[PDB]
Amino acid sequence: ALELASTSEFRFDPERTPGLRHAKNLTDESTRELERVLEENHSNHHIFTTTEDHKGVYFHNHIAHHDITIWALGANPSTIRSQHDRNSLYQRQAMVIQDSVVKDMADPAVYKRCLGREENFLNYCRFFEDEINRIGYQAVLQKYLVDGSEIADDMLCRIYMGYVHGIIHIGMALEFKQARLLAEGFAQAAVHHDWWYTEYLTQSEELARKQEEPALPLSDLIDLARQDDAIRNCSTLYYHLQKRKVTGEMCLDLEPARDGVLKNAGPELRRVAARYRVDPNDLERATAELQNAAVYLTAGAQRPPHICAFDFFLLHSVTSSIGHTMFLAEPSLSNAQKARLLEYTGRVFLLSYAGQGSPEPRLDWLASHPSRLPNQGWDEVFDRACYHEDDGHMCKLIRCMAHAEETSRPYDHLPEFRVKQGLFLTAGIAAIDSGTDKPMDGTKHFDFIRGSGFKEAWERFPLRT
């Protein structure tokens, strides 16, 4: 049973809540500043930084993830404040809380009616805080995620919507033991409305029931997707180059999964997805194997002769993967429930990977990455990640690869673990080495590649010297 901080406040402690992987000596001073900025973010900022029509899809508020991650990697108070303040500048104003709606949401008809509507984000936050206090967080995980009710089944698909930001939030809430962040996570999922995740995950689970072909590790199913004509050709770099006809502004009016993968290769991908069936009696290894496979498909997506670069879309597989360590540690979940969670996450990794062009892994090119700086261990990389001026993706990727190295170490001898122990630090050095002095402009990212599986995506990336 986790000892969660109160639904009504953020309370961190360098020894009680440092998470699964962290810097050596965390200060009280940094912890107090983190609690300050988290509450400013919760009360003042919306879960989405854009309106849906602005760029075509929602952009997400990463401030909770970034602040918490750089605290965990040993950021000083001044650095936490500087990073938080810069990312605050492009936020939307928080929605209004209507207490009557928060109470009425106890009627399942009302709960259902409010789903997918971003104006309900703080209403759901309060509804889930109230649920945590009424029945306890463990009963919340049953009722809103794994107990197999129509409401839990609906929410289990929503945590993956919007490039898996719901399950990232939920993972971080369990890892850092914050009931207030757990309610934020369910609320985030509740207000998404990416209907194609419900269809894909529902149809894939039904197909999996039939057990038509043997189960494979995720690493093997990543490889199988590339052999398929329909899957390997189902997407285009055009999703990352589309412009608004009038203004020439960037948009995602067409979306790789909805308009590409599921339109051109639905049956073929569902046939692969259907083979990711996890053994409820082998979850320590199956959880580590999913985490290794995320590093495999992400850090592996390299193209000689370019510098190492990380794909913005693919790295959500690495950052989402850490939460399964907490799901594994949770007594109140059955082995079958923990298996079903891993299955959903893996099938989404396959969908994301196909949308970016199913990049063929080049671990040989990754392994030869020349370190920009000498004598770089994880502690040196962690400290550099604190100062990297994006919205948190770089530091989350680095901390989650460092976690995966640790969960892989018992299994380094097994063939289904493609990423071997020394390559995790090389990948972390490659990530921070790809960073520039100006990684973002407002909400736009420059340091990450988009469409790693398409040769032309690499044109703006320098050659390795």
Ligand X SMILES: COc1cc(O)cc(C)c1O
443 lies in the site for ligand X, by CB under 6 A: yes
Q: Give me the least distance between CB of 338 and ligand X, in Å please.
A: 27
- Cα separation of 180 and 319, whole Å? 20
Q: 317-332 b/e with 16+ CB inside 10 Å = b?
A: bbbbbbbbbbbbebee
Q: Give me the least distance between CB of 230 and ligand X, in Å please.
A: 25
How many residues bind to ligand X according to rule CB under 6 A? 7
432 Rama sector, left if φ>0, alpha if ψ -120 to 50, beta otherwise? alpha
197 lies in the site for ligand X, by CB under 6 A: no
3-state helix, strand, coil in the chain (%, to 5): 60, 5, 35
Tokens of 70: 């750089």
Q: Give me the least distance between CB of 57 and ligand X, in Å please.
A: 6
160 lies in the site for ligand X, by CB under 6 A: no
| Residues linked to residue 445 through DSSP beta bridges, in sequence order | 440
Of 4 and 385, which has the nearer Cβ to ligand X? 385
CA angle 396, 397, 401 (to 5 degrees): 115
| Residues linked to residue 205 through DSSP beta bridges, in sequence order | none
Of 103 and 444, which has the nearer Cβ to ligand X? 444
Measured from the Cβ of residue 21, the count of other Cβ atoms closer than 10 Å reads 22
Of 11 and 445, which has the nearer Cβ to ligand X? 445
Candidates 55-63, 97-105, 344-352, 366-374; binding stretch for ligand X (CB under 6 A): 55-63
User: Are residues 314 and 451 in contact, defined by beta-carbon separation less than 8 angstroms?
Assistant: no
Residue type, 271: R
| Residues linked to residue 243 through DSSP beta bridges, in sequence order | 250
Q: Of residues 163-192, which lie at the interface with ligand X (CB under 6 A)?
A: 163
447 lies in the site for ligand X, by CB under 6 A: no
59 lies in the site for ligand X, by CB under 6 A: yes
Candidates 57-65, 234-242, 280-288, 368-376; binding stretch for ligand X (CB under 6 A): 57-65
Of 60 and 303, which has the nearer Cβ to ligand X? 60
Q: Give me the least distance between CB of 358 and ligand X, in Å please.
A: 19
Q: Which of 21, 22, 60, 388 binds ligand X (CB under 6 A)?
A: 60
Q: Of residues 113-152, which lie at the interface with ligand X (CB under 6 A)?
A: none
What are the backbone dihedrals phi and psi of residue 306, each rounded to the nearest 5 degrees, phi first? Answer: -75, 165
Instruction: Give me the long-range contacts of 126-131 (CB less than 8 A, separation at least 24).
Output: 126/97, 126/99, 126/102, 126/183, 127/102, 127/183, 127/187, 128/182, 128/183, 128/186, 128/187, 129/7, 129/8, 129/179, 129/180, 129/183, 130/7, 130/102, 131/183
Of 22 and 192, which has the nearer Cβ to ligand X? 192
Nearest residue to the partner ligand X, using Cβ:
60
Of 30 and 298, which has the nearer Cβ to ligand X? 298
Of 312 and 417, which has the nearer Cβ to ligand X? 312
391 lies in the site for ligand X, by CB under 6 A: yes
Q: Which of 18, 445, 461, 464 binds ligand X (CB under 6 A)?
A: 445
448 lies in the site for ligand X, by CB under 6 A: no
25 Rama sector, left if φ>0, alpha if ψ -120 to 50, beta otherwise? beta
- Binding-site ranges for ligand X (CB under 6 A): 57, 59-60, 163, 391, 443, 445
